[PDB]
Design a protein around this nucleic acid. Sequence first.
DNA 1: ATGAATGAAAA
DNA 2: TTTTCATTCAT
Length: 74
Amino acid sequence: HIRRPMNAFMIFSKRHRALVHQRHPNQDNRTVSKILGEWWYALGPKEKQKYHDLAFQVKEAHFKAHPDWKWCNK
DNA sequence: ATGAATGAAAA
DNA sequence: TTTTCATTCAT
């Protein structure tokens, strides 16, 4: 099963979700998601375009390690 | 034990 | 609107 290439904020979330959870004691993982969104807005273009470069580099190797793959929504 | 909903974005 | 990750919470 070929899954979609990760977004930029998806990579961000993967790298910082645990952190947000540790730094907001026993919160809900949806408030964790929200705070992750806040962190993403408050992030400087400096690293935002780094996560963007990461998303590009994952996307290329997804469009070549899987030829003829489409964004199919049922 | 299985599904819902929280977040950004490219499609 | 859909879905990529993750996961508490609700069912």
